[PDB]
Amino acid sequence: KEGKHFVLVHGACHGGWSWYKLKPLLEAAGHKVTALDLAASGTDLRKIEELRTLYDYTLPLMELMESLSADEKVILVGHSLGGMNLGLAMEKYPQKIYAAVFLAAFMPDSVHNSSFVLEQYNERTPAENWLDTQFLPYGSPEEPLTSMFFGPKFLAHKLYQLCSPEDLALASSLVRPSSLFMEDLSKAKYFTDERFGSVKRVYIVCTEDKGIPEEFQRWQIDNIGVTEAIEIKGADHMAMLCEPQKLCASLLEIAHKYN
Template sequence: MSKEALRVILIHGSCHGAWCWYKLLAELQSKGYNSVTAIDLAASGADSRRIPEDVRTFKDYNRPLMEFMSTVPDGEKVILVGHSFGGLSLAFAMDAFPEKIAAAIFVNALLPDTLHQPFYFIDQQLQQLSNRKIELEIKPVVITGKSEPFLTACFDSNVLATYVYQNCSFEDLSLASMMLRPTLNFSEDLSNCSPFTKEGFGSVDKICIICNEDALIKEDFVRWMIQNNGNVKETIEIEGADHMPMLSKPRELCQLLASIVDIYSIL
């Protein structure tokens, strides 16, 4: 079966956009994998919407992925790749469209389960950051008709350089400093969501890629999520990768994704 058999969909993490996959896209395309799409979630990357003026809920934020999945023809499957906060985006798509997903690849991403509400895993990670004195840049945004301001979050320059991009080139760090956009943690609506289902989210093959030098989502936390989930098909580690392996280790990540695509293309 050709390399065109399965489409690969790349989902970015918090504050980022489709732009962060540019090196990986080039690597995959150079090897003949041309059916690869990087999606901007709402109010991310080049998407014109803004947080919180236009996007206030996770459902709004994740709508571009859900709309894309709805256009996948019946009988066709894709491979989803989610990075960091993008793991939750994958989980919602897996729950809604399990029959359209051959496999979901979590790249040092939040990995929920079928027992806890989605926000549980965000809260656990935020506690980890707090315990390590890592603080995001929080700004209140007042919206007409809303009594309380929205608290947006972004990475400041120190956190970005020390914990997110520490193994990346200065050029990629500079690019990020220009391209990052504020986000929300969506605590209110994600705390009120039901856990993901075994029939949907639980039924899709899950593959986890661990970045062993990630200083933001630490390896021990990722392994805890994997153990907690209890339904991960395979775990793979990339040596020397920081939080942004698509930039710090694009060739290694490309090789892993290509091998996974090849396996699922012949199943």
């Protein structure tokens, strides 16, 4: 037949709703779209305190990748922390993916430590940017589990600066607690060059991003590695909300290219 299937994976503190302005566009071109809801996200009834590892969190995406047909490929699109999630999926079903796209996200590799990207980012970014963000523990002195919950100020100054007030009000009303999973990712080599490294990587840089500045974005493109690099000028962190059309046109071009 004709068309393509896109798998959208939101980032921390978000959900599938996040792709509500992009989904109609991709579909308007005749493609399949899945704005999945990772664990403890959107409407998923699982509590964040139930996720002990990055895997528990990526369970839904994983189960989806497992339900793909023999000749049913897909285009992965990870946003923010969604880049990490893609990793797990890429390692497990490399050939079931046409190409992985990292829209202003944390794109790992199969050379450095799994939490390398999230470590460098932290070190560069001062603990002041987080503003009113809540980091609450929910584990044990021996099995520490930290939670992350974006505050309203950090949402209106670092992620939604160039977004509409309607969009900020929506997010404020849906954002839930999540995590970055350090103790886990820092103690494991989840990705291998034979699997994770077999999937072509595409990165979409957001110039006006304040959560993950274009600086750290470009950095990953120069140190981690990419197959192609596309940028969206004028967009902040939530480029799917402030620049849907431009994003959709980018996602279509990627599709036409990589098979």
